Symmetry: D2
Subunit: 244 residues, 4 copies
């Protein structure tokens, strides 16, 4: 009866803050971790401390399609699925001229291939239930504008943005709404005026991004699909004419 | 214990503005209501806003005759003594073929659809700057901020202009912690169908196959006005049911 | 012989465009705001290439009267096939205190003028039944804000939206409508490598680098291009807060 | 020295018309073919019929990264390289829910992995010469808007759109300008009529010359201020939203 949300990489950072906020809104949370399992255990306890069920599982998206079957197992532990938040990994810089081909392919494996497989498994279950669903892909401002010395990261983020539009169009008949949240600079887990290149002059806290993800998963977002919501402190506004 | 933040929502006598005012009042905002000619509808919004324990002040705003009509924003600010949120809600769309459009009709559409938002935003931003406590401005545009509406070239151009104004205001007021964003809605249900709840399949050209309820737009506007949206500025959030996805390859 | 009217072709992008359209075989309608003898320089250089050239005074600062010169210039040629709406000068003004008449005057010359000129030009092209081309010179600030110039940015966005509407409403008449969005343009004196390190190409653009694309959008190979904004900016749109010159 | 331009998949279609127009503008043409080797010879002959040298070689993008080494061989025949055009392959449809993971990865191989490796090879040589360069990627309108039942093709076109912006930014100090041309519906080689696609505003698909001409312009000397952009040539495809009523 209680709706279920699976938030990948919810052991720390933006994923964990999203899992907490989806638990506040009343979702049972399926937590996923790559290595920091204790961080996932902390997230599960904080979700249970809210009076909601929390399940954790290991999922390694660097090896596909095998590493994506953990979504199937997590769904069976709950018996239903309503929300999938595909969270974004870390960014790696690599100059374009000398980038190894396998490094280029590995970034696509982590930054779009995993989300594609996890969304397929999620979308199938949501089609069976016939009650709709929400799939939110965490991209980046670099879904739209290039990041210097990070051509593969920029291209994979653009690919995930294109997958978001496609998924939203093909699943609209099943009332499965698919959107992307495009964060700008995200403050480190340890963390005013520290980043003057950004118009807001600081990185964003995880709750300033996780809150919009939570809104997209709730009842009132029932007319929003196919879109990429940019939460970036004005990042997209700063062109060469902008002097801080 | 902090002083009650006040929000002004223009054209909040019905439709998106009415629903936004209610949801902002639900979030603890005192509401400044505005009506163009439906004075009774604005009193109904005030009654419902007051029903939640919030103060409601209404006033007549005639954005067709500027810059005089924009002074009503000053009057609402005087009643509350402060201002924290401004929502520039959109007037109705009128069609006119591009080839046969009088130059005064073209100018009038810009008067109501971007000039009014510009003048109201100035007064509001000036107040927020004087307070030094930041603020929020949300411009309600349209999907036609981004894609043309046939037989509505002035509407489309003015919506694009308000989109550009939104980005400029966001860049120019960011040091005052005044965040400025647009909400770009698709097809909205008329008040007869909006209150009736459930019209599925009535607009198959749109992927979601129906118009949106005012609640489905106002909820995002209200989110942009509250504390969690403190890192969102300069953006245009499209709430359209897939309208933007539908190209010539789309089959209803 | 086809006729191309180019506004503000007494200097700058408008003149280089007018000359390039003349090499492509167009008769050129030249327009001047104040520099009449500069317009005659354009007419003379167009005539040196075998084309007919005419000039007329156009002032879009006062509408709808100032736009009637287009109608008069059309009557001298009898036909019209190409209209290029050039972009006037940019003036800054802070948003909080900008006077309302300054806001309205920027919309008058930067989108209202293009509206009336395009309306007249499109009317003539419909009657001929042979299609046509309308090219609006916008700016990168059709898409991204210019600091301290909110009215300039809003009007450039507006002309961008008008371009799409005109393209969609006129497509059945084979009138293709597009925009060209220039970045920084060198002054006629410089028309340098490293003078603008904020821009990725590190320099402004020459008028031939903008006008060449405008001329392409006016010829027969651009017969499938409509409703678009072509950005020629040396990478201006690429430079975000992560770009370090 | 005669400037050299490599046009991938120039054995037919847009790549063929782009090669002939680049030859008309004075380029020596390096021709690439996946399977129609006779088409590449026809392209080589038509290029030579305009007073230009043409060289052909097999390029198998279905097997990387050694398959892209044919670009290094093609450069060695000319000794220099000035422009590279990464032309698109064919489009295949596959529903999202049941699409196999290998078909998804294969589409990315042919539609962005190939252009990535070819652009690395071309860009390095352009840096050696120090005389600037041009790279033009043929994407699609579906770099920007979804194609129904083709999520992998859409995602890969977006990816190539992102690579275009990244390349243009990192290569700009070497005067290597990188742009994309995003075509809409293109006519088949037999038809390359009016009113055949009323859903499109121009009510017809585009001719290959209508797309190749802009590609050729982006490669010539007057496009020296244009980089990082995606030029959409679609007959108003992008303008058509649910409010468009075909006349």
């Amino acid at each position: 009866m209680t709706k279920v949300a699976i938030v990948t990489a919810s052991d720390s950072g933006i994923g964990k803050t999203t899992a907490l906020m989806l638990a506040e809104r009343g979702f049972d949370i399926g937590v996923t971790w790559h290595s920091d399992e204790q961080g996932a255990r902390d997230t599960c306890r904080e979700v249970e401390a809210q009076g909601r069920r929390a399940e954790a599982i290991h999922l390694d998206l660097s090896t596909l399609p095998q590493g994506a079957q953990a979504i199937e197992t997590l769904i069976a532990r709950f018996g239903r699925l309503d929300v999938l938040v595909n969270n974004a990994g870390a960014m790696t810089k690599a100059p374009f001229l000398d980038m190894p081909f396998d490094d280029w392919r590995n970034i696509f494996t982590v930054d779009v291939d995993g989300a594609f497989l996890c969304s397929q498994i999620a979308a199938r279950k949501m089609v069976e239930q016939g009650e709709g669903g929400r799939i939110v892909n965490i991209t980046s401002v670099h879904e739209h504008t290039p990041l210097p010395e990070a051509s593969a990261y920029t291209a994979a983020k653009h690919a995930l943005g294109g997958l978001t539009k496609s998924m939203a169009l093909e699943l609209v008949q099943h009332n499965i709404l698919v959107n992307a949240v495009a964060p700008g600079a995200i403050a480190t887990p340890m963390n005013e005026g520290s980043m003057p290149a950004i118009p807001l002059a600081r990185p964003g806290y995880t709750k300033e991004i996780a809150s919009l993800v939570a809104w997209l998963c709730d009842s009132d977002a029932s007319y929003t699909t196919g879109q990429s919501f940019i939460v970036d402190g004005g990042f997209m506004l700063a062109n060469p004419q902008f002097k801080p």
